[PDB]
Amino acid sequence: MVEIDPFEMAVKQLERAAQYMDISEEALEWLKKPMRIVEVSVPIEMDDGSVKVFTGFRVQHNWARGPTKGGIRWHPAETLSTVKALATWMTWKVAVVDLPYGGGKGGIIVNPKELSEREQERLARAYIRAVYDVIGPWTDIPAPDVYTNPKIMGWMMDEYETIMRRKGPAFGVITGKPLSIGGSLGRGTATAQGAIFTIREAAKALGIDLKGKKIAVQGYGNAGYYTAKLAKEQLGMTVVAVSDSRGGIYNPDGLDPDEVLKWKREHGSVKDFPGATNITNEELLELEVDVLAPAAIEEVITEKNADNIKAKIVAEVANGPVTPEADDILREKGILQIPDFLCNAGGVTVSYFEWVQNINGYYWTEEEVREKLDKKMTKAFWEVYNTHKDKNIHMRDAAYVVAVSRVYQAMKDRGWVKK
Numbered sequence: 001m002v003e004i005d006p007f008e009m010a011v012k013q014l015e016r017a018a019q020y021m022d023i024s025e026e027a028l029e030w031l032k033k034p035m036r037i038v039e040v041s042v043p044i045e046m047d048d049g050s051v052k053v054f055t056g057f058r059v060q061h062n063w064a065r066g067p068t069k070g071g072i073r074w075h076p077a078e079t080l081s082t083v084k085a086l087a088t089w090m091t092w093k094v095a096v097v098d099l100p101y102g103g104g105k106g107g108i109i110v111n112p113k114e115l116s117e118r119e120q121e122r123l124a125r126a127y128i129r130a131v132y133d134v135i136g137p138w139t140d141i142p143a144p145d146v147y148t149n150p151k152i153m154g155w156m157m158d159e160y161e162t163i164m165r166r167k168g169p170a171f172g173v174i175t176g177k178p179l180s181i182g183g184s185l186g187r188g189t190a191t192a193q194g195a196i197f198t199i200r201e202a203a204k205a206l207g208i209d210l211k212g213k214k215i216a217v218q219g220y221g222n223a224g225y226y227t228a229k230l231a232k233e234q235l236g237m238t239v240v241a242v243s244d245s246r247g248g249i250y251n252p253d254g255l256d257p258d259e260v261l262k263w264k265r266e267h268g269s270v271k272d273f274p275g276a277t278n279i280t281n282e283e284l285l286e287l288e289v290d291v292l293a294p295a296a297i298e299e300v301i302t303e304k305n306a307d308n309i310k311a312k313i314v315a316e317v318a319n320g321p322v323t324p325e326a327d328d329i330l331r332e333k334g335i336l337q338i339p340d341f342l343c344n345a346g347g348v349t350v351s352y353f354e355w356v357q358n359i360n361g362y363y364w365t366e367e368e369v370r371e372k373l374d375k376k377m378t379k380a381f382w383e384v385y386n387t388h389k390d391k392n393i394h395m396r397d398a399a400y401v402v403a404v405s406r407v408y409q410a411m412k413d414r415g416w417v418k419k
Contacts, residue, residue, distance in 0.1 A: 194346015
């Protein structure tokens with residue numbers, strides 16, 4: 001009786017979102033099954049002169065709004081219950097920011113750290129020849145995800161362009177491509193710039209000036225390094241705490257965000273920086289910071305460290321680091337938290353800006369992408385925040401009300417659901 005399923009906990013979050021709105025019963029049973037699941041066998045030729053067969057999936061959840069978009073995972077812990085869960089999760093993310101997109105995902109049961117560079121080409125190309133019949137520039141647009149990179153997304157475009165015989169906008173079949181093949185600028189800081197705008201706009205919602213406040217970021221990856229970098233160089237945050245998987249430091253005067261990265265490449269981690277106080281990962285949470293933004297791993301702020309957090313804005317960069325048990329603990333403290341698919345919607349929004357350039361054929365510049373990402377994320381916050389201020393419901397549950405109704409209005413106008 002101990003069962004934690006990924007797809008079952010993806011449906012229970014929808015039936016929690018059915019109570020706070022008026023939705024017909026015949027459309028509620030439509031959204032609990034993806035409309036097309038393709039599971040194929042992917043054969044490659046190894047370097048030993050032998051043939052293996054990997055099991056590769058593809059799940060398209062709902063194309064009511066438009067074409068579907070989702071990443072490609074390469075992990076040995078993949079199942080069909082995991083890919084169908086993130087596919088239903090993807091439709092609510094690409095709805096709340098007002099995109100013409102539906103949900104999708106794909107995965108191969110493989111372990112990429114035991115394949116050579118020649119074998120990764122034969123695996124990525126043979127994935128396209130199996131599921132070419134269910135993708136395309138107007139049908140399904142893959143994207144990079146865990147254990148993929150823009151190098152591999154260049155190969156899947158080349159194998160698609162050979163099959164298509166170049167009769168169509170073949171650069172739009174996959175996003176997150178390299179720079180000199182038809183990719184977009186402003187992809188490398190897409191999750192960081194897109195999250196920095198919502199923290200800037202949430203300053204106005206409480207009426208707070210950010211010229212000289214404090215911020216802390218857990219983790220120091222590429223989505224972690226650029227978040228604390230933009231805080232000083234744009235806003236004025238006295239960055240007083242950073243950390244990684246190894247350790248954490250502190251400064252009561254501030255931290256230059258690029259000065260730390262030069263130490264971390266020479267050393268192994270952020271441990272023992274000169275003029276710092278080596279503390280643990282746990283004490284970074286309970287510090288006196290104005291705005292906290294975790295990005296390290298899921299489930300970091302739990303039911304015992306729930307009431308220790310003293311802040312004003314908790315920005316969720318990583319995917320849901322706040323448990324539903326801790327969801328209602330912070331609200332009675334008076335803490336404004338942003339939802340998990342609203343603060344890191346900068347990944348899909350710039351990846352939509354790559355898909356717009358590839359279809360038109362006219363590439364933008366870096367001055368143009370930062371402007372239209374600013375108008376999207378500011379609008380997508382004030383639509384969510386005005387919903388929470390009216391029905392007096394929590395910000396996490398209010399985000400589904402806008403995401404479901406934007407899809408259900410598209411299902412009703414296409415005639416799929418009469419009632």
